Amino acid sequence: LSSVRYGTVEDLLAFANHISNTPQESGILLNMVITPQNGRYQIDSDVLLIPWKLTYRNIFIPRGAFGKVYLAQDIKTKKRMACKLIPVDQFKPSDVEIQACFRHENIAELYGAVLWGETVHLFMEAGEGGSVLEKLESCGPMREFEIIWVTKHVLKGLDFLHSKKVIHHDIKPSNIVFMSTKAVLVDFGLSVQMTEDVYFPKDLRGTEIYMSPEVILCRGHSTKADIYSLGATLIHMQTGTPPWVKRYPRSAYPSYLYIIHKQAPPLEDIADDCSPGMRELIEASLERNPNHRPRAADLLKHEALNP
């Protein structure tokens, strides 16, 4: 492959595998929202990298697990897209594999992948309203109805991913983005496709604050790891502050691995203003034993998220 062209999921998958296994830009486009010109797709000529514009008064380039995310606009279609820039050395095929093989309203769509220099450019569905993190950072704690609305979208995305034996591995406010009529899950760089009922980790993956005790242990875990991460995300949304941060601030020792392993679940971090329904939902999400922890499908049936 020496040019940028429209192709199949298989073409994209073969292209992504060739990068991770080491002149003019090359790549595979899955959607006609991106317009190649004579097999080219150049920055400042066929696509413009425009600034993200958040509407908050109180408070930008978000950082993913393996690269920064920019706002891009196709010059021909005028389609706004997220463009994640990943150095080839840091490129994991899962950053394209999940979004290319699986399609759901609550999972960010992949438009195309372009290699130029030593950088992989991932064109995706844009969450122009920013992420849950920016909302929390500028407005403080989220109202219950906002938490319910977001949780429902996240839970439909997780229910779908888990049905397909996919562990996201990094469920947190910055990976849940606002779109005009929905909230969507982003960043599949740390995601894994399970082949057995238990996944045995090679390394320690995720954001420590939202990390389950079984992930910290490295003795094997499953999709239930994402359910706990959601519970930790729910505490951050309800209180405006991530769990562990108020009780155990980090200074000399930045690691939370010991605290979380000895003291999880962080039930003490649920605010007093929390409703009985919401409290029950957060408490079940954070269950220490993953076997006793509910599935995303089970959480969708909860009273707190239904009329």
Ligand SMILES: Nc1nnc(-c2c[nH]c3ncc(-c4c[nH]c5ccccc45)cc23)o1
């Ligand atoms: N890590 C990662 N992997 N893929 C994505 C991604 C796909 N579509 C997106 N849309 C929006 C944002 C985003 C996050 N924080 C923000 C703050 C302001 C404005 C926008 C954002 C990120 C993405 O992100």
